[PDB]
RNA sequence: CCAGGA
């Protein structure tokens, strides 16, 4: 009865962008991206990759409440570097890493006879 | 901006009473007889056994937020093996010209007993602890 | 009542395995633990599904209309 | 009988209850389209308006403080200390 | 009683409650359906007109919508059916009956309601799912759990009513309660359990997690604290990252058994400027404790700040524990192979000790204690040995369980369980009682038909030798069942007896309140108390403080308080203050230090007359200890350089501050003498803590530091007085009623005694004289 | 259903307590909490 | 509830990915708090579990009968024979990160019961509704769309708070409230108000 | 040496409800008293003829399961034939604090 | 599996609940409390089968 | 019993004493016994304390007793609460009980009194003896649907046209 | 080859045992999550009941029909009805299944997932075939009928993910382990006497070097090398649970890059 | 009334 529809977890709302980038007030060159209809699956993945970027000073994500599929990701970079670009690169790195993972699995699978 | 204390001590005892990753170390200065030291150390990170000679340094520097890498090109003010950052919490007047200063490195406690460093140690959040050997 | 399709905990289809289990017991005389394991039910979540089932449907069928 | 201003002896400070009631009353009046005695610096909630009026002591209300005998001391909101 | 003192009411709602680590202390999760039913009548005004028109357009089915429109004309428009529900054009002064919305103040209540805290004002938070969600730390005041409890919600309908809720009964305001002059909400369960775990010396956090833990704090400055360990590998401690939730200015000191400034066992507590220096955070620190981190925060920073701290401490702790994990298993009840041999042999020797007293009693050699049967005397001994045993056996296991024991871990943090629980589970359940005595002979000369007659053995009269882990014998099982049933009977009965006691207290006190003359009167204006609680102070504003002057040796007092500018040894050293050199031998000044000391001696005798035992710790307004602490960090007090204070600055400064500690205001001897009286005790404390020697030698205060301390004592003291209007009657009734509800030489005590007391019972049960 | 056909009512010295004589005849655990506690016996 | 007086309501429902998991791929159906167990001393709950874990693997009926020679040690030995750690613990991995939990979770099957008390048959809200005939006050019970009782003890709390106007509202506007015409001479409700 | 009688089985001192409690000899006295009250409110198949009877309210469990941990006394109580619950995979853990 | 033991009255099942009474025709001696003229009483609740 | 007493040197020191414990009460008589401290003698029966030592001592004993019941359960209630109860039972000049007999039989208004235990009888007497309700009690205002003289309603609020015209 | 590497240990129709080296734990997990939750599958979603004389409820049966695995090989060429342009369903977005069963036999008549028949046009794509892993070739036992017991119904199967319903979950349990010797100190082993004796050694211990006590703690050490086992239900083949999982997560990340692009 | 829930 007070139960929300199951698609609300993944299907974007009426006039609701996937990303909402707001700037952090408390810190210089820091931003806050709210990811709608997303969970840990993506949050922790991105956060961990931004951690690999040397020019990235701060990176963390939080699912403020479990009833809602959305998470806030805070990115802080060195002066001159843009956090949107930092996010862009980490996103790219992830894809390229997954691309190799698929290629490598495919090759290895084809070798099996079962 | 500069060093505040330097001496080489020799560890008398190492104590992990129920603590698996931390130890209270008891040392005395090889130079000054008056000087003694009590200190909690992450022994899982930098192991310590008794009779080890250790260079123990203070220094107020080398404020605002903390930055992780770039330290490759940056001047690592550590010619030392294990470094801590903590706060001075008490100034004990242990008779005569003798003084004792208490340092908390986020719970990891330290007590340095001596005399001379009147013109050095201060009640500051800023105090690093450097250890080599 | 009536074998669950899919184990609640992991969702391995368990719907097919019922008659086969009941058969490995009457026809093969086999003990419950071996029959389950024969049927490839390795995780205890899957094991509990068959091992602890009560097929009440069979009583329900005993009434005429 | 009404105690003279020069003979008032109740607290020079506003009671929790007084302040809660002034804020309640002003907010109610503000909400019933009463004239607002302050610059609403974009404000729209009548309680936040009330808070603002009391913050600048521009509330034209008086507390009639009754004594157990029946007498009373009248105190202006402008004159009451708001340490709460 | 049923239609007038109580009423069935509109704008009410009720459902199953459930907890939430993600709600703020003062909010309440309201199911969408409940929000869509409950309504607030809002007047159409230039400020809201557009918004209101939109909710009207939204209608009764959409969430932020409305149900009715009330025209000036008086007739109600039903938006559900009106053909004009679309083209509805609002007019200033009309009322829109709109849905309950996020941040509306609402009365939340858990029945019974034997407390003012059983009904508190919360912020709405419309949420999905059919349950009322509440912050876990607010559980205790309501006395709620989530085993199937339901709670009541009432919606105010006026701007006035709303103000009443938000301004008087909102959850943050209710944190420090007058019931026991301490916090009535603290950190519980997961957060309490996780808080110990986080704050051990052993506990270190890697960068990755530190960043998430930091971001999780909603008011975090954006400043990454310098790691306690910088190379090899940057590492932060629990203590460190918890301190981010602790606000600046917060000063706390606590010494537990064996605490040194080196806290070897990570004992007690030391928080300086809202940063933990040492000790593990648990029940004593972060619970609903008198000295509490919460008590200090509410008092020092505000109720709104403290309420934020609850959420903060939980958001960090819960997050950390989510990733650390915590469990509890049978392995946690299991005790060592040799510890079990040692336990068995503890019961074994106690079993003989009992047989020995039995053989002694059967041989008529036993000699009864004056005022007791030979038998009564025997049973006392048996019962005493068997308990001594259960405890020994228990204390054996408790010691043998490592710090890794999940049960020990919960007991250690204070989150759940006590010593006895370990004892009964791991080692031995113990002796079973009914009506105080061991299991009696229900059958002729025996407890069960499986026993021989005249069997006074532990096994026959209900001693459960075994642990719960081991299991109970049928005999042990039935005796435990008898003993168990006894508690269920009183739980059942007490419930209504306790209820009626509450009613009578309330009905006798209801009409009592503090008037604008500081007098406590009833509906007849008859004076009950001349001044509220003999001190004219509000109970919330009071804290246990130590009156130094009271105890110690006459010599120790002297060293602490005496200043003698006419003696080379007992003067204030010129290191203490600048005037030190010029102060020696000042006869005129010495007259002032003589007054000072003479008053301090006067005070000592007086306090020794009040508190006959010499008890120093008493609940008084204004925590002077804390003001000094703050002056010290506020003014960065240099414990080296000499003060810019005069003896006149101190001596007279204090004398003057005292005249400004106003409780009663009238200009007349009666009221003025009355004022002096009310303020007496507080001043003895004030004079003890602010004597010249103390201020200079101990506190090392500068003139500005002192000037500030004085102003703050004044301000705090004034804030501390009761507010005319305070319904101290009901307060007092509920403050005795609520505790009576939690109630389980041998004299009639507890619930049945309270019953005797309130009834002014003529024929009492245990009359007794205490002849000194 | 079973436990309802084995229920005992006791209307109006210390009746609520589990007596020794209740051994093997009445269940030491199956009794209500509150008002009827120990006055509703189960065989 | 379990068969050990260990009752409770659902606080949240998590999907399989959010849930903590064994390396073996097993996930709980239910997560119950450690804080239940100590104060309660429901040891048989823990034993039920251990025995049920063995039972599930062994495919033999786990005898949980009262007075027997079955020991927690006996069952422990049997579980070690199955490859699991004897005291029922299992290392779990966090569902959100995949990182091992610093703690090992007591995990295994336990017989849980579904009770007659469900939230949707309980939930109730009212804001103006049917009134009694006699007293002209809100009708009783969820069933009848009744209003809740702001009773005597609730009046007391309001009196304690000093919420004078909040109380007046509850008792008047929010319920009962009516208007009569009384006489100034004999203070009676005698007045024939032909107000029109 | 005087023994006139022997107990058939000591577990028989228990009633219908308490006889479904696994290891009641390992629980604190009232926790048992609680279960023999709750099981009366536990859902399951009450009778196999449910589909042929018109009763006000009937609650039937979709997939009932016999318990993995059982009592020898349940044999007579028809419990394994007509159960009141399901064997759930239960973790005793601190998780999201929910 | 139905076990019988109830009646069917107007279509609803009904269970007679056993009622517990003091057995009759039974001699019992009781001490009559501190404020009483009578110190002890022998009672017999005599009734026909 | 162990007693804390100041030593010659000043510090409070444990100086235990022999104390007698009775199984019954006779205040008047045991007080006049040679060898006791008639200044220290205490009874749990405060009804006796009242009768022998006056109403003031009656209050002190009554509090002592109330305090014990709470502290025995290991609970803390701030003084003032217990003090108030103790005072209310006292003020009349004797031991006025928290019962239908005690408090409920005082001079408070009929409507307030009828709200507890004797309702109809309280109102019949109210009529018969032409009682006048002051309407000062919380209870009456609740029965009247009026704002009670409680906190928020313990004072009145007025607009001042002077101050009103001043701000514009 | 390049970045993260795979080394398959065992294969079948139902299981994939492998080793994932040169990867972030976060990545290993995110893939694990996706496989469970975000891979699309076809499953019965609407059940119109014409006749039911069974001992079971209309919805009881209906529920089961969703849990019956259907061929989701070519699931990628089917549209989500939500995204499709019709009115309810069509061929471009659904598979229509039919089930007519009757107790002709004096003996108990069984109803199986094999008794399901496709009535919609498949557009020649591998979809909607009830997955039969059963030795005797019956598949899932839906129902039991006696004599005049008839069951006549219609099923509409739709594309979906496990987030909406666990019926669209193509994977059974996913096994996941790393560091079988606790070299990383990621767990503090609960014990009574010895954690080594008390806790069972992992299978994967053989695929890693034991720590050798006479060595200091490697703090610098990080988590790479993950021993996993992916189990399929039928809808998609074991390999494709891994591949499609890798691909879904890749697509999921691309959406973010694209979102930034539109911004 | 009867049965139950915190
Ligand atoms: Mg509860
Ligand atoms: Zn499974
Ligand atoms: Zn008239
Ligand atoms: Zn379509």
Coordinates of C-alpha atoms in Angstrom, one line a residue, chain E residues 311-654:
Chain E
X311 CA 22.5 12.3 13.7
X312 CA 26.1 13.1 13.1
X313 CA 27.5 10.5 15.6
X314 CA 25.1 7.9 14.2
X315 CA 25.7 8.6 10.4
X316 CA 29.6 8.0 11.0
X317 CA 29.3 5.1 13.5
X318 CA 26.6 3.2 11.6
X319 CA 28.4 3.6 8.3
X320 CA 31.7 2.4 9.8
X321 CA 30.0 -0.6 11.5
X322 CA 28.1 -1.4 8.3
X323 CA 31.5 -2.1 6.7
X324 CA 33.2 -3.5 9.8
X325 CA 30.2 -5.8 10.7
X326 CA 29.2 -7.2 14.1
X327 CA 27.6 -10.6 15.0
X328 CA 26.9 -12.9 18.0
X329 CA 26.9 -16.7 18.2
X330 CA 26.8 -19.9 20.4
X331 CA 30.6 -19.7 20.4
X332 CA 30.2 -16.5 22.5
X333 CA 28.5 -18.5 25.3
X334 CA 31.1 -21.3 25.2
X335 CA 33.8 -21.1 27.9
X336 CA 37.3 -22.9 28.0
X337 CA 37.6 -26.6 28.7
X338 CA 39.6 -26.0 32.0
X339 CA 37.4 -23.0 32.9
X340 CA 34.4 -25.5 32.8
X341 CA 36.4 -28.0 35.0
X342 CA 37.1 -25.0 37.4
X343 CA 33.4 -24.0 37.3
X344 CA 32.1 -27.6 38.0
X345 CA 34.6 -27.8 40.9
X346 CA 33.3 -24.4 42.3
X347 CA 29.7 -25.7 42.5
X348 CA 31.1 -29.1 43.8
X349 CA 32.8 -27.4 46.8
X350 CA 29.8 -25.2 47.5
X351 CA 27.5 -28.3 47.3
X352 CA 29.6 -29.9 50.2
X353 CA 29.7 -26.5 52.2
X354 CA 25.9 -26.7 52.1
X355 CA 25.7 -30.5 53.1
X356 CA 28.1 -29.6 56.0
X357 CA 25.7 -26.9 57.4
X358 CA 22.8 -29.4 56.8
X359 CA 24.6 -32.2 58.8
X360 CA 25.4 -29.5 61.4
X361 CA 21.7 -28.5 61.6
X362 CA 20.5 -32.2 61.8
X363 CA 22.9 -32.8 64.7
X364 CA 21.3 -29.8 66.6
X365 CA 24.7 -28.0 66.9
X366 CA 23.5 -25.0 64.8
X367 CA 23.2 -21.8 66.9
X368 CA 20.5 -19.3 65.5
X369 CA 21.2 -15.6 64.9
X370 CA 19.4 -13.4 67.4
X371 CA 15.9 -12.7 66.1
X372 CA 15.6 -15.7 63.8
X373 CA 14.4 -19.4 63.8
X374 CA 17.1 -22.1 63.8
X375 CA 15.6 -23.0 60.4
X376 CA 15.4 -19.4 59.1
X377 CA 19.1 -19.0 60.1
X378 CA 20.0 -22.2 58.2
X379 CA 18.1 -21.4 54.9
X380 CA 19.8 -17.9 55.0
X381 CA 23.3 -19.7 55.0
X382 CA 22.4 -22.3 52.3
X383 CA 20.9 -19.5 50.0
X384 CA 24.0 -17.3 50.6
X385 CA 26.5 -20.1 49.7
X386 CA 24.7 -21.1 46.6
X387 CA 24.6 -17.5 45.3
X388 CA 28.3 -16.9 46.3
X389 CA 28.8 -20.0 44.0
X390 CA 26.7 -18.9 41.0
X391 CA 28.6 -15.6 41.0
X392 CA 32.1 -17.2 41.4
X393 CA 31.3 -19.6 38.5
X394 CA 30.1 -16.6 36.5
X395 CA 33.1 -14.4 37.3
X396 CA 35.3 -17.4 36.2
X397 CA 33.7 -17.4 32.7
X398 CA 33.6 -13.6 32.4
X399 CA 37.4 -13.5 32.9
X400 CA 38.1 -16.5 30.6
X401 CA 36.2 -14.9 27.7
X402 CA 38.6 -12.9 25.5
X403 CA 37.9 -9.3 24.3
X404 CA 36.8 -10.9 21.0
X405 CA 33.7 -12.3 22.7
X406 CA 30.8 -10.6 20.9
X407 CA 28.7 -10.8 24.2
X408 CA 31.6 -9.3 26.3
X409 CA 31.9 -6.6 23.5
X410 CA 28.2 -5.6 23.9
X411 CA 28.5 -5.7 27.7
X412 CA 31.7 -3.6 27.5
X413 CA 30.1 -0.8 25.4
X414 CA 27.0 -1.0 27.5
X415 CA 24.8 -1.5 24.4
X416 CA 23.1 -4.7 25.8
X417 CA 23.6 -7.4 28.5
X418 CA 25.2 -7.4 32.0
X419 CA 27.4 -9.7 34.1
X420 CA 24.6 -12.1 35.2
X421 CA 23.6 -12.7 31.5
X422 CA 27.2 -14.1 30.8
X423 CA 27.1 -16.0 34.1
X424 CA 23.7 -17.7 33.5
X425 CA 24.5 -18.5 29.8
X426 CA 28.1 -19.7 30.1
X427 CA 28.5 -21.1 33.6
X428 CA 25.5 -21.6 36.0
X429 CA 21.8 -20.4 36.1
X430 CA 21.6 -20.5 39.9
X431 CA 19.1 -20.7 42.7
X432 CA 15.4 -20.2 41.9
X433 CA 13.1 -18.2 44.3
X434 CA 9.4 -17.8 44.8
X435 CA 8.2 -15.3 47.5
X436 CA 11.8 -14.8 48.4
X437 CA 12.2 -18.4 49.6
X438 CA 13.6 -21.4 47.7
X439 CA 11.1 -23.8 46.0
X440 CA 8.9 -25.0 48.8
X441 CA 7.3 -28.3 49.6
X442 CA 4.1 -28.2 47.5
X443 CA 3.8 -31.9 48.0
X444 CA 3.9 -33.2 51.6
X445 CA 7.6 -32.7 52.8
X446 CA 9.0 -32.7 49.2
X447 CA 9.2 -30.3 46.1
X448 CA 8.5 -33.0 43.5
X449 CA 7.5 -36.8 43.6
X450 CA 11.0 -37.6 42.3
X451 CA 12.4 -36.7 45.7
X452 CA 12.6 -38.3 49.1
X453 CA 10.8 -36.5 52.0
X454 CA 12.6 -33.9 54.1
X455 CA 15.2 -33.1 51.3
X456 CA 16.7 -29.6 51.9
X457 CA 19.4 -30.2 49.3
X458 CA 20.2 -27.5 46.6
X459 CA 18.9 -29.9 43.9
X460 CA 15.6 -30.4 45.8
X461 CA 14.9 -26.8 46.6
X462 CA 15.5 -25.3 43.1
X463 CA 19.2 -24.8 42.5
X464 CA 19.8 -24.8 38.8
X465 CA 23.4 -26.1 38.7
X466 CA 23.7 -26.0 34.8
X467 CA 24.3 -23.2 32.2
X468 CA 21.7 -22.4 29.5
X469 CA 24.4 -23.6 27.0
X470 CA 24.5 -27.0 28.8
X471 CA 20.7 -27.4 29.3
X472 CA 18.4 -27.9 32.3
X473 CA 17.3 -31.2 33.9
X474 CA 13.4 -31.7 34.1
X475 CA 13.5 -30.8 37.8
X476 CA 15.7 -27.7 37.1
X477 CA 13.3 -26.8 34.1
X478 CA 10.2 -27.0 36.3
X479 CA 11.7 -25.0 39.2
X480 CA 13.0 -22.3 36.8
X481 CA 9.5 -22.3 35.4
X482 CA 7.9 -21.6 38.9
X483 CA 10.4 -18.8 39.5
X484 CA 9.9 -17.5 36.0
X485 CA 6.1 -17.4 36.5
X486 CA 6.5 -15.2 39.6
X487 CA 8.0 -12.3 37.6
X488 CA 5.3 -12.6 34.9
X489 CA 2.7 -12.3 37.7
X490 CA 4.1 -9.1 39.1
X491 CA 4.8 -7.7 35.5
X492 CA 1.0 -8.3 34.9
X493 CA -0.3 -6.9 38.2
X494 CA 2.2 -3.9 38.8
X495 CA 1.0 -2.6 35.4
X496 CA -2.5 -1.4 36.8
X497 CA -1.4 -0.7 40.4
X498 CA 1.4 1.5 39.0
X499 CA -1.1 3.1 36.6
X500 CA -3.5 4.2 39.3
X501 CA -0.6 5.6 41.5
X502 CA 0.3 7.8 38.5
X503 CA -3.3 9.1 38.2
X504 CA -3.7 10.0 41.9
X505 CA -0.3 11.9 41.9
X506 CA -1.5 13.8 38.8
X507 CA -4.9 14.6 40.0
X508 CA -3.6 15.8 43.4
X509 CA -1.0 18.1 41.8
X510 CA -2.5 19.2 38.4
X511 CA -3.5 22.9 39.5
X512 CA 0.0 23.6 40.9
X513 CA 2.2 26.1 39.0
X514 CA 4.9 28.9 39.5
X515 CA 3.2 32.3 39.5
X516 CA 4.8 35.6 38.5
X517 CA 5.9 36.1 42.2
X518 CA 8.1 32.9 42.0
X519 CA 5.5 31.3 44.5
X520 CA 4.2 27.8 43.9
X521 CA 0.4 27.9 44.3
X522 CA -2.7 25.8 43.5
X523 CA -6.2 26.8 42.1
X524 CA -6.9 28.4 45.5
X525 CA -3.8 30.6 45.4
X526 CA -2.7 28.8 48.6
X527 CA 1.1 28.8 48.7
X528 CA 2.5 25.2 48.5
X529 CA 6.2 26.2 48.2
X530 CA 7.2 29.8 48.7
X531 CA 9.9 29.5 46.0
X532 CA 10.0 26.5 43.4
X533 CA 11.9 23.6 44.9
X534 CA 13.3 25.9 47.7
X535 CA 15.9 27.4 45.2
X536 CA 13.6 29.0 42.5
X537 CA 15.5 27.2 39.7
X538 CA 14.3 25.1 36.7
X539 CA 15.5 21.4 37.1
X540 CA 16.9 21.1 33.5
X541 CA 19.4 23.9 34.2
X542 CA 20.9 22.0 37.2
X543 CA 24.0 19.8 37.3
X544 CA 25.9 17.8 40.0
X545 CA 28.8 20.0 41.1
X546 CA 31.4 19.5 43.9
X547 CA 31.5 22.0 46.8
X548 CA 35.3 21.9 47.5
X549 CA 35.2 23.9 50.8
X550 CA 33.1 21.0 52.4
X551 CA 35.7 18.2 52.8
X552 CA 39.5 17.6 53.2
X553 CA 41.7 18.3 56.1
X554 CA 41.6 21.7 57.9
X555 CA 45.3 22.0 56.7
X556 CA 44.6 21.0 53.1
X557 CA 41.8 23.7 53.0
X558 CA 44.3 26.3 54.4
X559 CA 46.9 25.5 51.6
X560 CA 44.2 25.8 49.0
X561 CA 42.5 29.0 50.2
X562 CA 44.7 31.1 52.5
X563 CA 46.5 34.2 51.2
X564 CA 48.7 36.0 53.8
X565 CA 50.4 39.1 52.2
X566 CA 52.0 39.7 55.6
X567 CA 54.1 36.4 55.6
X568 CA 57.0 35.8 53.2
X569 CA 56.0 32.1 52.6
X570 CA 52.2 32.5 52.4
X571 CA 52.0 35.5 50.0
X572 CA 51.1 35.1 46.3
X573 CA 54.4 34.6 44.5
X574 CA 55.2 37.5 42.0
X575 CA 55.0 34.7 39.3
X576 CA 51.2 34.5 40.0
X577 CA 50.3 38.2 39.3
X578 CA 52.2 41.4 38.3
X579 CA 51.5 43.3 41.5
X580 CA 53.1 40.4 43.5
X581 CA 56.2 42.4 44.5
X582 CA 54.3 45.6 45.6
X583 CA 51.6 43.5 47.3
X584 CA 53.8 42.1 50.2
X585 CA 52.9 43.6 53.6
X586 CA 49.8 45.6 52.4
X587 CA 47.8 45.8 55.7
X588 CA 44.9 47.5 53.9
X589 CA 44.7 44.7 51.3
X590 CA 45.2 42.0 53.9
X591 CA 42.0 43.3 55.6
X592 CA 40.2 42.2 52.3
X593 CA 41.9 38.7 52.2
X594 CA 41.0 38.2 55.9
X595 CA 37.3 38.9 55.0
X596 CA 37.7 36.4 52.0
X597 CA 39.2 33.6 54.2
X598 CA 36.8 34.3 57.1
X599 CA 33.8 33.9 54.8
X600 CA 35.3 30.7 53.3
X601 CA 35.7 29.3 56.8
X602 CA 32.1 30.5 57.7
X603 CA 30.8 28.7 54.5
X604 CA 32.7 25.4 55.4
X605 CA 31.0 25.2 58.8
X606 CA 27.6 26.0 57.2
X607 CA 27.9 23.4 54.5
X608 CA 29.0 20.8 57.0
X609 CA 25.7 21.7 58.9
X610 CA 23.6 21.2 55.8
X611 CA 25.2 18.0 54.4
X612 CA 26.0 16.2 57.6
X613 CA 27.8 13.2 56.0
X614 CA 30.2 15.7 54.2
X615 CA 28.8 14.8 50.7
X616 CA 30.4 17.4 48.3
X617 CA 28.6 16.6 45.0
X618 CA 25.2 18.3 44.7
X619 CA 23.0 19.4 41.8
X620 CA 23.4 23.2 41.4
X621 CA 22.8 25.6 38.5
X622 CA 25.8 27.1 36.5
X623 CA 28.7 24.6 35.8
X624 CA 31.5 26.9 37.0
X625 CA 34.1 24.1 36.2
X626 CA 33.2 24.3 32.5
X627 CA 33.2 28.2 32.4
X628 CA 36.8 28.2 33.7
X629 CA 37.8 25.4 31.1
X630 CA 36.3 27.6 28.3
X631 CA 37.9 30.8 29.6
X632 CA 41.2 28.9 29.4
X633 CA 40.8 27.8 25.7
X634 CA 38.8 31.0 24.7
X635 CA 41.6 33.2 26.0
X636 CA 44.6 30.8 25.4
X637 CA 45.6 31.0 29.0
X638 CA 49.4 31.0 29.4
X639 CA 50.1 28.8 32.5
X640 CA 53.6 30.6 32.7
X641 CA 53.2 34.5 32.6
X642 CA 51.7 36.4 35.7
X643 CA 48.1 37.7 35.8
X644 CA 47.0 41.3 35.3
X645 CA 44.5 41.0 38.2
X646 CA 44.4 43.0 41.4
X647 CA 43.3 41.4 44.7
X648 CA 40.5 44.1 44.6
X649 CA 39.7 42.9 41.0
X650 CA 39.1 39.3 42.3
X651 CA 37.7 39.9 45.8
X652 CA 35.3 42.7 45.0
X653 CA 34.5 41.3 41.5
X654 CA 33.0 38.2 43.1

